Amino acid sequence: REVLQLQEEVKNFITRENLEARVEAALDSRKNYNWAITREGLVVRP
Amino acid sequence: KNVLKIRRRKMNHHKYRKLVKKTRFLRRKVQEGRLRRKQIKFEKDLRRIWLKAGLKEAPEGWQTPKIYLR
Amino acid sequence: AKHLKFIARTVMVQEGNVESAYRTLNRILTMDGLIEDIKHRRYYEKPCRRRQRESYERCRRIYNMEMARKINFLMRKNRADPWQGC
Amino acid sequence: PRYELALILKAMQRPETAATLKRTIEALMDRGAIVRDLENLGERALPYRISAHSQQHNRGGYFLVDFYAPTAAVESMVEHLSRDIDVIRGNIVKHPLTQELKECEGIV
Amino acid sequence: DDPPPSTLLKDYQNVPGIEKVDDVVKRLLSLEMANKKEMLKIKQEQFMKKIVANPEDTRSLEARIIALSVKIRSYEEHLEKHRKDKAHKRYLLMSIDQRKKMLKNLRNTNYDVFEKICWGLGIEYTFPPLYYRRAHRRFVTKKALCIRVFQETQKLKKRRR
Amino acid sequence: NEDLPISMENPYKEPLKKCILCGKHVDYKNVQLLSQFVSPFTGCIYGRHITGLCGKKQKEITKAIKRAQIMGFMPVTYKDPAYLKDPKVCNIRYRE
RNA sequence: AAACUCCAGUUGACACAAAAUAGACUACGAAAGUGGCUUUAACAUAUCUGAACACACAAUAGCUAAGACCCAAACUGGGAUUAGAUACCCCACUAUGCUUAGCCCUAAACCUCAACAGUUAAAUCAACAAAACUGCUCGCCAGAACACUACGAGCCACAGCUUAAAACUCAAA
Ligand SMILES: NC(=O)c1ccc[n+]([C@@H]2O[C@H](COP(=O)([O-])OP(=O)(O)OC[C@H]3O[C@@H](n4cnc5c(N)ncnc54)[C@H](O)[C@@H]3O)[C@@H](O)[C@H]2O)c1
Ligand code: FES
Ligand SMILES: [K+]
Ligand SMILES: [Mg+2]
Ligand SMILES: [Mg+2]
Ligand SMILES: [Mg+2]
Ligand SMILES: [Mg+2]
Ligand SMILES: [Mg+2]
Ligand SMILES: [Mg+2]
Ligand SMILES: [Mg+2]
Ligand SMILES: [Mg+2]
Ligand SMILES: [Mg+2]
């Protein structure tokens, strides 16, 4: 299972061919890792 | 615990360190003379060995090193 | 030095009550440990003395909380005597 | 192993930022890295003023580069990140996902 | 010699179809993309296959000797670079003593396996010294003189006879 | 006798108490979460008697805060003003 | 009072020093020790015991070479106090605390509890400390002082460290 998962994941890795397009797409994207916790133990997503 | 024993150890040690300071120069001469005599004794023991073995002199090329002189 | 100014340790005054703002700032600095840190940093505290002091305060706090708990637990029995006379 | 490079890049225009990202990923690959994905966290004010390459920065672009590299590569990459003038601050860490989320039974 | 960096990890070597995967997956599942511990595991497996009768039994004295030998090699490699690491020097010396004890037990119990272990791991078994006493300057010089005097006495006796 | 008691683990045993972050991943990039355990005015990390966190998660939060602070993700001398209106999870009041 | 006034306040740039808060945690390491961040190596042994000397280590202080120098500071000066101050208080500044390569091998180096295994039954148990014991092994001890001493031996140590007595004296310690 791990090997198959890695094999399917490798299809989306950055190579020397897609470096331009992937860099451009990443520059046109925003990732957010911020999230808060409440006194009840719940996650509040921004 | 014995605080008298530790205070006695302190007084004995402090008195001793005063004595060595006062007689530091006389002690050095005694130590160097003792080292000279000890080297002489070591050489005499080595000579005893090669004399008892049968050799009239030391082994060819042998020189008794000075193992105690700083 | 490399941080933005007027954000840290800053209190705004309400309706010209400057004394209240100062006392609130003092409470904040004392609660966050800054005041005692400044007072302790005036002279060097030796590591052994620091360890002894920290152990002493920790054990003092533990003992005081335990005694308070005991007194609060035994305070329930302090009511009017229900079997007075006998 | 798996590593995450947190990159704080100079506040530049889109072409220079793209060129810097390409150069960084190319160096990673030259040192033997397999780059998994590139995330953009955004351009934001730095938590504090940072002095790098005889320039003071108050704002910067935050990027994440996930990759697989040999253990010997990391040191080399660090030195490279020290020379790049468009990098305010680069830090390579072991990828947080590889760290195992051990389970807890609660307060004993 | 270390295993080649292209070698697969010990846990990813018997997976079915592992030869039918892409080159990138092969690189990711190789020693090149792993810490030194997986590479030491590969050395241990290779030594087990080369030496012991049952490579699966890790409980035998020979298997423990092989594992400790790999650990000792790792410690020596660490100490070549880290000359002032006293803790790792202690660990190396302790592991060497433990391996000597295990080798003594193996020699006392199974001499054939002892010989196989000694040949395979390149270990030259040495018997412990009978006495533990300081060889200070006086003793060393005196012993050298005594050896020289014995040599000269032998020469003189040969000449006489 | 069928009415005799039987050996058994306590069926009424209440589930052991959990900290608010139990089962959740603490990451150095999540400045919003790490800012909930620092003083708004000084940025000092709150102790476990204030945060209410367990020892393991207290250590995790401390390490994440230090990593974020040194890597240029979190301010040191104050809490980021953007996170001043987040839910309050620490048992501390300045009467402010 | 001396000292500085090339002084002081804000702002900006700016360490070979030290590592608030977390830590009210009690973890890692054989001990010594270890509390800023990242990464690489990495924390011996599936019987136990096993050394003043063998093999490795050992806080602080100290000795050689080079380097760094913010702050602190034996020593050394100046100011003040005092009957006097060769101290305490104030100012300044060294060796030293730091890095590199070697030494030195000492601590109230103490949990003042030797290592492993086992028991909670007996009168538990001189006292105090830290509940009382058992099996097995190594190390050590046989009145006080002389004595962390003398001599001998060993040592990169030379006013040093380890081991370590005897004579005279006393009825105690
Ligand atoms: N002296 C030896 O070389 C030696 C050789 C084999 C066994 N042992 C054993 O070690 C024990 C201690 O003997 P000791 O009192 O006469 O020595 P010791 O303590 O009186 O010292 C004298 C010499 O013996 C050495 N020594 C001390 N302890 C030792 C040990 N455990 N093992 C080996 N050498 C040691 C020392 O290095 C020293 O050179 C004894 O049980 C003995 O049987 C000693
Ligand atoms: S109580 Fe489970 S992680 Fe804190
Ligand atoms: K103690
Ligand atoms: Mg042992
Ligand atoms: Mg002995
Ligand atoms: Mg030392
Ligand atoms: Mg020094
Ligand atoms: Mg200690
Ligand atoms: Mg022992
Ligand atoms: Mg012993
Ligand atoms: Mg006596
Ligand atoms: Mg002596």
Side-chain angles (χ1 to χ4, degrees), chain E residues 59-94:
Chain E
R59 298 294 296 163
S60 52
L61 186 58
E62 46 263 56
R64 293 167 52 205
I65 288 160
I66 286 164
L68 194 51
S69 299
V70 164
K71 216 173 286 212
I72 282 154
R73 178 70 275 172
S74 187
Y75 293 148
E76 282 158 346
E77 270 147 7
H78 172 98
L79 285 165
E80 293 179 353
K81 169 171 174 45
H82 305 281
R83 183 180 63 83
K84 296 184 288 293
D85 200 324
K86 303 304 190 204
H88 280 93
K89 201 185 169 165
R90 185 194 161 241
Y91 291 133
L92 173 67
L93 294 169
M94 270 196 305

mmCIF file of all heavy atoms in Angstrom, chain E residues 59-94:
data_model
loop_
_atom_site.group_PDB
_atom_site.id
_atom_site.type_symbol
_atom_site.label_atom_id
_atom_site.label_comp_id
_atom_site.label_asym_id
_atom_site.label_seq_id
_atom_site.Cartn_x
_atom_site.Cartn_y
_atom_site.Cartn_z
ATOM 1 N N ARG E 59 18.523 -14.278 17.572
ATOM 2 C CA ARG E 59 18.751 -14.574 18.979
ATOM 3 C C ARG E 59 20.033 -15.348 19.240
ATOM 4 O O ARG E 59 20.406 -15.516 20.405
ATOM 5 C CB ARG E 59 17.560 -15.360 19.539
ATOM 6 C CG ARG E 59 16.228 -14.620 19.505
ATOM 7 C CD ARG E 59 16.255 -13.427 20.446
ATOM 8 N NE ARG E 59 16.408 -13.875 21.826
ATOM 9 C CZ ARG E 59 16.783 -13.105 22.839
ATOM 10 N NH1 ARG E 59 17.075 -11.827 22.669
ATOM 11 N NH2 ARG E 59 16.879 -13.638 24.055
ATOM 12 N N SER E 60 20.719 -15.815 18.204
ATOM 13 C CA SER E 60 21.934 -16.578 18.422
ATOM 14 C C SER E 60 23.084 -15.651 18.805
ATOM 15 O O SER E 60 23.059 -14.443 18.556
ATOM 16 C CB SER E 60 22.295 -17.382 17.173
ATOM 17 O OG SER E 60 22.334 -16.558 16.022
ATOM 18 N N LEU E 61 24.106 -16.241 19.430
ATOM 19 C CA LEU E 61 25.273 -15.469 19.840
ATOM 20 C C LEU E 61 25.980 -14.868 18.631
ATOM 21 O O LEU E 61 26.468 -13.733 18.684
ATOM 22 C CB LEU E 61 26.224 -16.361 20.638
ATOM 23 C CG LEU E 61 27.452 -15.723 21.289
ATOM 24 C CD1 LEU E 61 27.057 -14.613 22.251
ATOM 25 C CD2 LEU E 61 28.264 -16.788 22.008
ATOM 26 N N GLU E 62 26.043 -15.621 17.531
ATOM 27 C CA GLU E 62 26.681 -15.123 16.316
ATOM 28 C C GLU E 62 25.951 -13.899 15.771
ATOM 29 O O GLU E 62 26.582 -12.937 15.316
ATOM 30 C CB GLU E 62 26.741 -16.233 15.262
ATOM 31 C CG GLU E 62 25.447 -17.022 15.072
ATOM 32 C CD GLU E 62 25.435 -18.327 15.844
ATOM 33 O OE1 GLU E 62 25.632 -18.293 17.077
ATOM 34 O OE2 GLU E 62 25.227 -19.387 15.218
ATOM 35 N N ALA E 63 24.616 -13.919 15.797
ATOM 36 C CA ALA E 63 23.853 -12.773 15.312
ATOM 37 C C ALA E 63 24.108 -11.538 16.168
ATOM 38 O O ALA E 63 24.256 -10.425 15.644
ATOM 39 C CB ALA E 63 22.363 -13.110 15.287
ATOM 40 N N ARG E 64 24.157 -11.715 17.490
ATOM 41 C CA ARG E 64 24.468 -10.598 18.374
ATOM 42 C C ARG E 64 25.867 -10.064 18.102
ATOM 43 O O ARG E 64 26.091 -8.848 18.114
ATOM 44 C CB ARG E 64 24.333 -11.037 19.832
ATOM 45 C CG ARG E 64 22.907 -11.365 20.248
ATOM 46 C CD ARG E 64 22.863 -12.085 21.587
ATOM 47 N NE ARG E 64 23.615 -11.377 22.616
ATOM 48 C CZ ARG E 64 24.146 -11.940 23.693
ATOM 49 N NH1 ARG E 64 24.019 -13.236 23.935
ATOM 50 N NH2 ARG E 64 24.820 -11.184 24.555
ATOM 51 N N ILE E 65 26.821 -10.962 17.850
ATOM 52 C CA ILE E 65 28.176 -10.534 17.521
ATOM 53 C C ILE E 65 28.180 -9.714 16.239
ATOM 54 O O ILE E 65 28.860 -8.687 16.147
ATOM 55 C CB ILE E 65 29.107 -11.757 17.415
ATOM 56 C CG1 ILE E 65 29.384 -12.332 18.805
ATOM 57 C CG2 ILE E 65 30.417 -11.378 16.731
ATOM 58 C CD1 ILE E 65 29.860 -13.768 18.790
ATOM 59 N N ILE E 66 27.429 -10.154 15.227
ATOM 60 C CA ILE E 66 27.377 -9.423 13.960
ATOM 61 C C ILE E 66 26.783 -8.033 14.174
ATOM 62 O O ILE E 66 27.296 -7.027 13.662
ATOM 63 C CB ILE E 66 26.580 -10.224 12.915
ATOM 64 C CG1 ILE E 66 27.412 -11.406 12.410
ATOM 65 C CG2 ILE E 66 26.161 -9.329 11.748
ATOM 66 C CD1 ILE E 66 26.605 -12.464 11.683
ATOM 67 N N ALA E 67 25.684 -7.961 14.927
ATOM 68 C CA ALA E 67 25.044 -6.673 15.179
ATOM 69 C C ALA E 67 25.986 -5.729 15.918
ATOM 70 O O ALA E 67 26.110 -4.547 15.568
ATOM 71 C CB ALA E 67 23.754 -6.876 15.971
ATOM 72 N N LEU E 68 26.670 -6.238 16.944
ATOM 73 C CA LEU E 68 27.587 -5.392 17.697
ATOM 74 C C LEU E 68 28.791 -4.995 16.853
ATOM 75 O O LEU E 68 29.345 -3.909 17.033
ATOM 76 C CB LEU E 68 28.032 -6.101 18.978
ATOM 77 C CG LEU E 68 28.717 -5.244 20.051
ATOM 78 C CD1 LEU E 68 27.918 -3.990 20.397
ATOM 79 C CD2 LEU E 68 28.954 -6.069 21.300
ATOM 80 N N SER E 69 29.213 -5.857 15.924
ATOM 81 C CA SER E 69 30.297 -5.491 15.018
ATOM 82 C C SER E 69 29.882 -4.346 14.105
ATOM 83 O O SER E 69 30.663 -3.417 13.863
ATOM 84 C CB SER E 69 30.720 -6.706 14.195
ATOM 85 O OG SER E 69 31.186 -7.751 15.031
ATOM 86 N N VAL E 70 28.655 -4.396 13.586
ATOM 87 C CA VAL E 70 28.156 -3.289 12.775
ATOM 88 C C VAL E 70 28.105 -2.009 13.602
ATOM 89 O O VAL E 70 28.501 -0.930 13.138
ATOM 90 C CB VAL E 70 26.779 -3.641 12.183
ATOM 91 C CG1 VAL E 70 26.074 -2.392 11.663
ATOM 92 C CG2 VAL E 70 26.925 -4.673 11.075
ATOM 93 N N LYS E 71 27.622 -2.110 14.844
ATOM 94 C CA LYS E 71 27.569 -0.938 15.713
ATOM 95 C C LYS E 71 28.966 -0.388 15.989
ATOM 96 O O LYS E 71 29.165 0.831 16.037
ATOM 97 C CB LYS E 71 26.862 -1.291 17.021
ATOM 98 C CG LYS E 71 26.013 -0.165 17.585
ATOM 99 C CD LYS E 71 25.196 -0.621 18.787
ATOM 100 C CE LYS E 71 24.024 -1.503 18.380
ATOM 101 N NZ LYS E 71 22.856 -1.329 19.286
ATOM 102 N N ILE E 72 29.942 -1.275 16.186
ATOM 103 C CA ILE E 72 31.313 -0.847 16.453
ATOM 104 C C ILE E 72 31.895 -0.142 15.235
ATOM 105 O O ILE E 72 32.609 0.859 15.363
ATOM 106 C CB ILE E 72 32.169 -2.057 16.874
ATOM 107 C CG1 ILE E 72 31.888 -2.423 18.332
ATOM 108 C CG2 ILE E 72 33.656 -1.771 16.689
ATOM 109 C CD1 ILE E 72 32.146 -3.880 18.653
ATOM 110 N N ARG E 73 31.621 -0.665 14.039
ATOM 111 C CA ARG E 73 32.067 0.008 12.824
ATOM 112 C C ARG E 73 31.450 1.397 12.722
ATOM 113 O O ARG E 73 32.130 2.365 12.354
ATOM 114 C CB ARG E 73 31.713 -0.841 11.601
ATOM 115 C CG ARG E 73 32.085 -0.245 10.240
ATOM 116 C CD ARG E 73 33.589 -0.226 9.999
ATOM 117 N NE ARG E 73 34.236 0.955 10.559
ATOM 118 C CZ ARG E 73 35.549 1.134 10.624
ATOM 119 N NH1 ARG E 73 36.397 0.214 10.192
ATOM 120 N NH2 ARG E 73 36.025 2.268 11.128
ATOM 121 N N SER E 74 30.161 1.514 13.049
ATOM 122 C CA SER E 74 29.515 2.823 13.033
ATOM 123 C C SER E 74 30.172 3.775 14.027
ATOM 124 O O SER E 74 30.413 4.947 13.711
ATOM 125 C CB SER E 74 28.025 2.673 13.340
ATOM 126 O OG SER E 74 27.346 3.906 13.179
ATOM 127 N N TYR E 75 30.469 3.289 15.234
ATOM 128 C CA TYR E 75 31.121 4.133 16.232
ATOM 129 C C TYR E 75 32.503 4.575 15.765
ATOM 130 O O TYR E 75 32.893 5.730 15.964
ATOM 131 C CB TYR E 75 31.230 3.394 17.568
ATOM 132 C CG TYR E 75 29.914 3.101 18.266
ATOM 133 C CD1 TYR E 75 29.766 1.963 19.047
ATOM 134 C CD2 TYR E 75 28.829 3.963 18.158
ATOM 135 C CE1 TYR E 75 28.577 1.686 19.691
ATOM 136 C CE2 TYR E 75 27.635 3.693 18.800
ATOM 137 C CZ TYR E 75 27.517 2.556 19.567
ATOM 138 O OH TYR E 75 26.330 2.281 20.205
ATOM 139 N N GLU E 76 33.264 3.665 15.153
ATOM 140 C CA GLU E 76 34.589 4.029 14.663
ATOM 141 C C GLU E 76 34.496 5.079 13.565
ATOM 142 O O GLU E 76 35.280 6.036 13.541
ATOM 143 C CB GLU E 76 35.321 2.789 14.153
ATOM 144 C CG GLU E 76 35.910 1.920 15.255
ATOM 145 C CD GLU E 76 36.157 0.484 14.823
ATOM 146 O OE1 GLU E 76 35.643 0.071 13.762
ATOM 147 O OE2 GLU E 76 36.874 -0.236 15.549
ATOM 148 N N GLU E 77 33.540 4.920 12.646
ATOM 149 C CA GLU E 77 33.355 5.921 11.600
ATOM 150 C C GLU E 77 32.976 7.268 12.199
ATOM 151 O O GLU E 77 33.453 8.315 11.742
ATOM 152 C CB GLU E 77 32.292 5.455 10.606
ATOM 153 C CG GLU E 77 32.853 4.642 9.445
ATOM 154 C CD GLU E 77 31.903 3.564 8.945
ATOM 155 O OE1 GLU E 77 30.739 3.520 9.397
ATOM 156 O OE2 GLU E 77 32.326 2.758 8.090
ATOM 157 N N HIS E 78 32.119 7.263 13.221
ATOM 158 C CA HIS E 78 31.774 8.505 13.904
ATOM 159 C C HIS E 78 33.006 9.147 14.532
ATOM 160 O O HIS E 78 33.197 10.364 14.438
ATOM 161 C CB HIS E 78 30.706 8.228 14.966
ATOM 162 C CG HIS E 78 30.417 9.393 15.861
ATOM 163 N ND1 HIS E 78 29.344 10.235 15.663
ATOM 164 C CD2 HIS E 78 31.044 9.842 16.975
ATOM 165 C CE1 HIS E 78 29.331 11.158 16.608
ATOM 166 N NE2 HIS E 78 30.353 10.943 17.415
ATOM 167 N N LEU E 79 33.855 8.342 15.171
ATOM 168 C CA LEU E 79 34.991 8.890 15.905
ATOM 169 C C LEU E 79 36.134 9.319 14.995
ATOM 170 O O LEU E 79 36.986 10.101 15.430
ATOM 171 C CB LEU E 79 35.493 7.872 16.930
ATOM 172 C CG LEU E 79 34.612 7.726 18.174
ATOM 173 C CD1 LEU E 79 34.978 6.472 18.944
ATOM 174 C CD2 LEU E 79 34.723 8.953 19.070
ATOM 175 N N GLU E 80 36.188 8.827 13.755
ATOM 176 C CA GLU E 80 37.172 9.365 12.817
ATOM 177 C C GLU E 80 36.971 10.862 12.614
ATOM 178 O O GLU E 80 37.941 11.630 12.606
ATOM 179 C CB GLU E 80 37.106 8.641 11.471
ATOM 180 C CG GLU E 80 37.542 7.188 11.500
ATOM 181 C CD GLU E 80 37.433 6.523 10.141
ATOM 182 O OE1 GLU E 80 36.901 7.162 9.209
ATOM 183 O OE2 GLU E 80 37.877 5.364 10.006
ATOM 184 N N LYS E 81 35.722 11.295 12.452
ATOM 185 C CA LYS E 81 35.400 12.709 12.318
ATOM 186 C C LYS E 81 35.317 13.406 13.671
ATOM 187 O O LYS E 81 35.812 14.528 13.824
ATOM 188 C CB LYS E 81 34.076 12.868 11.563
ATOM 189 C CG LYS E 81 33.488 14.273 11.573
ATOM 190 C CD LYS E 81 32.302 14.373 10.623
ATOM 191 C CE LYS E 81 31.598 15.719 10.723
ATOM 192 N NZ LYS E 81 32.544 16.870 10.749
ATOM 193 N N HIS E 82 34.699 12.754 14.656
ATOM 194 C CA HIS E 82 34.450 13.343 15.971
ATOM 195 C C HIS E 82 35.503 12.830 16.952
ATOM 196 O O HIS E 82 35.264 11.934 17.759
ATOM 197 C CB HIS E 82 33.032 13.014 16.421
ATOM 198 C CG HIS E 82 31.983 13.435 15.441
ATOM 199 N ND1 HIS E 82 31.541 14.736 15.336
ATOM 200 C CD2 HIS E 82 31.303 12.732 14.505
ATOM 201 C CE1 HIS E 82 30.625 14.813 14.388
ATOM 202 N NE2 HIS E 82 30.462 13.611 13.868
ATOM 203 N N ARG E 83 36.695 13.427 16.872
ATOM 204 C CA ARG E 83 37.816 12.973 17.687
ATOM 205 C C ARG E 83 37.618 13.255 19.172
ATOM 206 O O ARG E 83 38.119 12.491 20.004
ATOM 207 C CB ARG E 83 39.112 13.629 17.203
ATOM 208 C CG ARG E 83 40.367 13.175 17.943
ATOM 209 C CD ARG E 83 41.617 13.857 17.404
ATOM 210 N NE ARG E 83 41.590 15.303 17.594
ATOM 211 C CZ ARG E 83 41.935 15.926 18.714
ATOM 212 N NH1 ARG E 83 42.334 15.259 19.786
ATOM 213 N NH2 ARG E 83 41.879 17.254 18.760
ATOM 214 N N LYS E 84 36.903 14.324 19.525
ATOM 215 C CA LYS E 84 36.753 14.748 20.911
ATOM 216 C C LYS E 84 35.425 14.309 21.523
ATOM 217 O O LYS E 84 35.018 14.853 22.555
ATOM 218 C CB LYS E 84 36.904 16.266 21.013
ATOM 219 C CG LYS E 84 38.288 16.773 20.632
ATOM 220 C CD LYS E 84 38.432 18.275 20.849
ATOM 221 C CE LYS E 84 37.656 19.084 19.819
ATOM 222 N NZ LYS E 84 38.213 18.933 18.447
ATOM 223 N N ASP E 85 34.745 13.341 20.913
ATOM 224 C CA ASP E 85 33.491 12.813 21.453
ATOM 225 C C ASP E 85 33.828 11.722 22.463
ATOM 226 O O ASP E 85 33.969 10.547 22.122
ATOM 227 C CB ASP E 85 32.603 12.288 20.333
ATOM 228 C CG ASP E 85 31.150 12.184 20.746
ATOM 229 O OD1 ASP E 85 30.886 11.839 21.917
ATOM 230 O OD2 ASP E 85 30.269 12.435 19.899
ATOM 231 N N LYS E 86 33.959 12.121 23.730
ATOM 232 C CA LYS E 86 34.325 11.169 24.773
ATOM 233 C C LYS E 86 33.225 10.144 25.022
ATOM 234 O O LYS E 86 33.521 8.974 25.286
ATOM 235 C CB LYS E 86 34.655 11.914 26.067
ATOM 236 C CG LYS E 86 35.766 12.949 25.937
ATOM 237 C CD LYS E 86 37.049 12.346 25.384
ATOM 238 C CE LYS E 86 38.213 13.315 25.490
ATOM 239 N NZ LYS E 86 39.273 13.025 24.485
ATOM 240 N N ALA E 87 31.958 10.560 24.952
ATOM 241 C CA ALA E 87 30.863 9.622 25.178
ATOM 242 C C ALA E 87 30.875 8.503 24.144
ATOM 243 O O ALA E 87 30.708 7.325 24.484
ATOM 244 C CB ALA E 87 29.526 10.361 25.151
ATOM 245 N N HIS E 88 31.092 8.849 22.875
ATOM 246 C CA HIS E 88 31.120 7.829 21.836
ATOM 247 C C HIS E 88 32.390 6.991 21.902
ATOM 248 O O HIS E 88 32.363 5.813 21.538
ATOM 249 C CB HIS E 88 30.967 8.481 20.463
ATOM 250 C CG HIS E 88 29.550 8.826 20.125
ATOM 251 N ND1 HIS E 88 29.001 10.061 20.391
ATOM 252 C CD2 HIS E 88 28.563 8.090 19.559
ATOM 253 C CE1 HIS E 88 27.741 10.076 19.996
ATOM 254 N NE2 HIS E 88 27.450 8.891 19.489
ATOM 255 N N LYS E 89 33.497 7.563 22.381
ATOM 256 C CA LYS E 89 34.678 6.752 22.661
ATOM 257 C C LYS E 89 34.379 5.705 23.727
ATOM 258 O O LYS E 89 34.765 4.535 23.594
ATOM 259 C CB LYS E 89 35.833 7.650 23.101
ATOM 260 C CG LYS E 89 37.204 7.025 22.930
ATOM 261 C CD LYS E 89 38.298 7.920 23.488
ATOM 262 C CE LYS E 89 39.625 7.184 23.568
ATOM 263 N NZ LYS E 89 40.773 8.112 23.763
ATOM 264 N N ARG E 90 33.684 6.111 24.792
ATOM 265 C CA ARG E 90 33.275 5.160 25.819
ATOM 266 C C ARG E 90 32.378 4.081 25.229
ATOM 267 O O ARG E 90 32.532 2.893 25.534
ATOM 268 C CB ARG E 90 32.543 5.887 26.947
ATOM 269 C CG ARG E 90 32.185 4.996 28.131
ATOM 270 C CD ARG E 90 31.176 5.662 29.042
ATOM 271 N NE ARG E 90 30.504 4.685 29.895
ATOM 272 C CZ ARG E 90 29.198 4.438 29.912
ATOM 273 N NH1 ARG E 90 28.364 5.011 29.057
ATOM 274 N NH2 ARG E 90 28.716 3.577 30.802
ATOM 275 N N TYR E 91 31.414 4.485 24.400
ATOM 276 C CA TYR E 91 30.506 3.512 23.802
ATOM 277 C C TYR E 91 31.267 2.521 22.930
ATOM 278 O O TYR E 91 30.997 1.315 22.966
ATOM 279 C CB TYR E 91 29.426 4.228 22.986
ATOM 280 C CG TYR E 91 28.436 5.027 23.814
ATOM 281 C CD1 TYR E 91 28.092 6.324 23.457
ATOM 282 C CD2 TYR E 91 27.843 4.486 24.948
ATOM 283 C CE1 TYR E 91 27.194 7.059 24.204
ATOM 284 C CE2 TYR E 91 26.943 5.213 25.703
ATOM 285 C CZ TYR E 91 26.622 6.499 25.326
ATOM 286 O OH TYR E 91 25.725 7.227 26.072
ATOM 287 N N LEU E 92 32.234 3.009 22.150
ATOM 288 C CA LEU E 92 33.036 2.124 21.311
ATOM 289 C C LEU E 92 33.819 1.128 22.157
ATOM 290 O O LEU E 92 33.831 -0.075 21.866
ATOM 291 C CB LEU E 92 33.982 2.953 20.437
ATOM 292 C CG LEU E 92 35.016 2.187 19.602
ATOM 293 C CD1 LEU E 92 34.328 1.381 18.519
ATOM 294 C CD2 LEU E 92 36.033 3.136 18.990
ATOM 295 N N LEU E 93 34.495 1.611 23.202
ATOM 296 C CA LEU E 93 35.291 0.711 24.031
ATOM 297 C C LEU E 93 34.409 -0.322 24.725
ATOM 298 O O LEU E 93 34.761 -1.508 24.798
ATOM 299 C CB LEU E 93 36.092 1.516 25.055
ATOM 300 C CG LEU E 93 37.166 2.437 24.469
ATOM 301 C CD1 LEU E 93 37.710 3.374 25.534
ATOM 302 C CD2 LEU E 93 38.295 1.632 23.838
ATOM 303 N N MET E 94 33.253 0.109 25.234
ATOM 304 C CA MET E 94 32.343 -0.815 25.897
ATOM 305 C C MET E 94 31.823 -1.866 24.925
ATOM 306 O O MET E 94 31.739 -3.050 25.269
ATOM 307 C CB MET E 94 31.183 -0.036 26.518
ATOM 308 C CG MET E 94 31.435 0.421 27.945
ATOM 309 S SD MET E 94 29.926 0.908 28.803
ATOM 310 C CE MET E 94 29.265 2.132 27.675
#
